[PDB]
Every structure is written in structure tokens, then in C-alpha cells.
Amino acid sequence: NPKWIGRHKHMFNFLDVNHNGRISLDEMVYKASDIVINNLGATPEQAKRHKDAVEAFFGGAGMKYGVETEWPEYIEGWKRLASEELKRYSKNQITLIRLWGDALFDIIDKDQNGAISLDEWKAYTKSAGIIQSSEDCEETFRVCDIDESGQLDVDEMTRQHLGFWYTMDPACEKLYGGAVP
Ligand SMILES: [Ca+2]
Ligand SMILES: [Ca+2]
Numbered sequence: 352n353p354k355w356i357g358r359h360k361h362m363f364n365f366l367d368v369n370h371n372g373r374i375s376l377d378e379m380v381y382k383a384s385d386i387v388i389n390n391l392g393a394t395p396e397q398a399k400r401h402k403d404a405v406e407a408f409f410g411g412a413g414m415k416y417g418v419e420t421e422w423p424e425y426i427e428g429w430k431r432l433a434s435e436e437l438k439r440y441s442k443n444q445i446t447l448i449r450l451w452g453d454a455l456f457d458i459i460d461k462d463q464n465g466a467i468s469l470d471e472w473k474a475y476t477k478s479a480g481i482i483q484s485s486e487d488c489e490e491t492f493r494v495c496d497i498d499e500s501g502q503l504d505v506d507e508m509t510r511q512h513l514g515f516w517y518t519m520d521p522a523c524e525k526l527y528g529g530a531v532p
């Protein structure tokens with residue numbers, strides 16, 4: 352699973368505030384709160400809801416306040432969480448990631464219309480530390496926007512999070528690495 356592992360290594364590095372190669376729940380929750388408040392302009396109410404949910408999400412992966420976790424244990428923790436949460440999702444049940452994604456959604460939905468516009472998505476992608484062209488940002492928006500409505504709903508954004516945090520690499524390759532001639 353090199354692609355899932357790679358997303359997770361880049362995220363571990365992003366949330367490892369002191370850059371020492373070990374991570375705590377304090378680092379992870381600190382950096383996530385800092386971004387929602389200072390990059391995405393969350394209100395106090397918004398930030399507290401997000402804090403509680405992100406704490407439960409990252410806690411589910413086995414991270415704890417006051418404890419430093421090394422990479423092997425970190426990634427095994429995410430594997431375990433992903434496996435349990437994908438079972439819940441398969442049974443149409445509530446997940447920790449869905450609860451997190453709900454609190455985040457309210458914050459990135461700046462115009463409170465219940466859908467994420469392209470502009471809203473550009474701000475969110477930037478908040479996660481991504482630097483990329485307009486064209487690349489638009490492509491990942493189109494990928495997220497399954498019904499091509501032009502805005503991203505809660506279900507689309509849930510699938511987005513599930514794909515990033517939990518979904519393992521496809522078992523088989525496609526002809527042309529999945530490209531179309
Ligand atoms: Ca650290
Ligand atoms: Ca909106």
C-alpha cells in the first residue's frame with residue numbers, strides 16, 4: 352500500500368509540529384485547531400466542535416495526550432482504525448471520521464449554503480498545506496464532485512475523507528495506469 356502509506360507519512364510530517372519524527376495527540380490536535388482557527392476562520396463554537404471531533408478521530412488511531420508515538424505504532428494504529436471504521440461505513444453506520452468531517456464541513460462552508468464551492472475548496476486545500484496550480488485544484492474538485500453538480504455536498508466530502516485516511520491501494524492495476532487514450 353505505498354500510496355496510503357505515503358499520504359500518511361506526509362500527514363505525520365505535517366502534524367509533527369517539532370519535526371522530531373515522533374508524534375503526540377497534543378501535536379496533532381494543536382496543529383489541526385491552529386489551522387481551522389487561523390487559516391479557515393472558525394468561530395469559537397466551530398473550533399470547539401472541531402476540536403472535540405478531531406480529538407476523537409485521532410484518538411481512535413491510538414494517539415494520546417502526553418505520549419509520543421513513533422511511526423511503526425502510529426501507522427499500525429491507523430490501519431486498525433481504518434479497518435474498524437470501514438466496517439461501520441459498510442453497514443451504513445456513523446463513524447469517527449464522519450463526525451470529524453461534519454465539524455470540518457461547517458467551517459469550510461463559509462457561505463453557510465450547505466455545499467462547498469470551488470473557492471471554498473481552494474481555501475480548504477491550501478489549509479492542508481497543499482501548494483498546486485488552479486488546474487490541479489480544479490481536477491481534485493471534479494474528482495470529489497461525483498454528481499458534477501458544481502459544489503460538494505456532505506456525502507461527497509465524507510467519501511473524500513474516507514478515500515484519503517482509510518482506503519487502501521487498489522488490488523489490481525488498470526491498463527495504462529488508468530489513463531484513457
Ligand atoms: Ca513531534
Ligand atoms: Ca458554501
Ligand SMILES: [Ca+2]
Pocket residue numbers: 496497498499500501502503504507
Ligand atoms: Ca456535487
